[PDB]
Amino acid sequence: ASLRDIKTRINATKKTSQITKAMEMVSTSKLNRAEQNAKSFVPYMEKIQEVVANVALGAGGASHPMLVSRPVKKTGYLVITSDRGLAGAYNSNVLRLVYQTIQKRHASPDEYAIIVIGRVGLSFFRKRNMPVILDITRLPDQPSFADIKEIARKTVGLFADGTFDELYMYYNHYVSAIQQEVTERKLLPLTDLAENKQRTVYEFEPSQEEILDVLLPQYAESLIYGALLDAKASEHAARMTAMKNATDNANELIRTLTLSYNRARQAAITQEITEIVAGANAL
């Protein structure tokens, strides 16, 4: 084409590379802050899981730990996706797994009801006919326990109130800084876990139907800092890697287009000189 077209395309590519690099530099700090936030809750989670693992021998003194439930009353699904795009496959992989699982296992519409975190998932489940409930569109970049405490509480209460048969959950696990894995998890009812040394019920009140009836809702509500924090970490890592790739591709486009610009302007110069000199020669 012309030098106009070539330089316009180069300028567009330059601007896009600037935007992508800025997004990456933003995302790096978010990743670091998400990691140092996830470091905070670890002792609290360890304490609560220690207490529940101590009491986990149970002897059947519990309701929801009772494994079975009303067959296929409603299957619980909890999915955590981003509230904003540009993350690559972060939302797509999880939603793909969710659709595969529902269509292969719980195909009828009444067999299940799905809970979504992040507006991408609700946009998905409103684009295609799926029974979405408890949707939330906005989340803080560095959350805490109280941010969606009510959402977590109601997700727990839909199984605590007999309105579910069982509950599953889907989210990206922050495997590494650049590698992440989608997670399968049978969330409710509860299953076994790693062991803790304390076994004696030394705290003075030891009634199972008194300690459990209140501990269990909060241990279930622990899902917030169990899952959403690593989901945010995976989202930030996906953004960072995607912006890296975008910047690399933009710079490759820039080098190729400049390599074309060179021959274009060279031919233009030759045309100018030839047009002047051939007119001068004959007259």
Binding site: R4, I19, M23, R84, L86, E272, I276, G279, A280, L283
Partner: protein
């Protein structure tokens, strides 16, 4: 035209204004004349003597003891290219510049002057005044800050932006729409009669708004208004 104006300057000792329709056509005619006479073309086909012809025209428009001649020249820019020889050689002689924009013309903002590209050498604290200079500097800074934030908004919602920058956006809307005006000769286009605004009225109106005196007024009341009081009059007419 230049010699007719020079008579009024030199002889009668007056002060004269020159209005030149288009200098791009003057340069085009020069290049055509040179090509007819048979000279070799210069860069992008212009005449070799472009700089000398332009200087010969532009040097006689100066002020002396007996009088002064000011000139306002309209320039056409082919295909938004400011590196074309005609504008690039007329840029050397000017004291003030004014870039008019299709983009601002479409939004209904006349006279469609770009407030950021427009520069002048009279915008100095010792010439126009300290308060005028401060006001103009703040207006320019706020407008440029608004320009930058717009592309951030285009990818990340304004609900994400910080409170102070939202204030900057709020005030920049008012400033941008207040820069517009209604003209006398705009009656033939719209029916709305024009206005004339003194420089003190301008600087005071822009000291306000920037101060925050008119944040509650809607943006649509500022367009093509004239003096600041007319903004309040229109707002009252709209019940706001």
């Amino acid at each position: 035209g230049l010699t007719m104006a020079e008579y009024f300057r030199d002889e009668q000792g007056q002060d004269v204004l020159l209005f030149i329709d288009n200098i791009f056509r003057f340069t085009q005619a020069g290049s055509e004349v040179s090509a007819l006479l048979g000279r070799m073309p210069s860069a992008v086909g212009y005449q070799p003597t472009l700089a000398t012809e332009m200087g010969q025209l532009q040097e006689r428009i100066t002020s002396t003891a007996k009088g002064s001649i000011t000139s306002i020249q309209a320039i056409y820019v082919p295909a938004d290219d400011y590196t074309d020889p005609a504008p690039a050689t007329t840029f050397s002689h000017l004291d003030a510049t004014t870039n008019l924009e299709r983009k601002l013309a479409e939004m209904g903002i006349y006279p469609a002057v770009d407030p950021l590209a427009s520069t002048s050498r009279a915008l100095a604290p010792e010439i126009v005044g300290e308060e005028h200079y401060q006001v103009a500097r703040k207006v320019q800074q706020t407008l440029q800050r608004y320009k930058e934030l717009q592309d951030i908004i285009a990818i990340l919602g304004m609900d994400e932006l910080s409170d102070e920058d939202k204030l900057v956006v709020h005030r920049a809307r008012r400033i941008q729409f207040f820069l517009s005006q209604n003209f006398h000769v705009a009656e033939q286009f719209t029916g709305q009669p024009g206005s004339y605004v003194p420089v003190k009225e301008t600087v005071r109106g822009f000291k306000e708004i920037l101060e925050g005196k008119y944040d509650h007024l809607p943006e649509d009341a500022f367009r093509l208004v004239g003096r600041i009081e007319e903004v309040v009059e229109k707002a009252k007419a709209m019940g706001v």
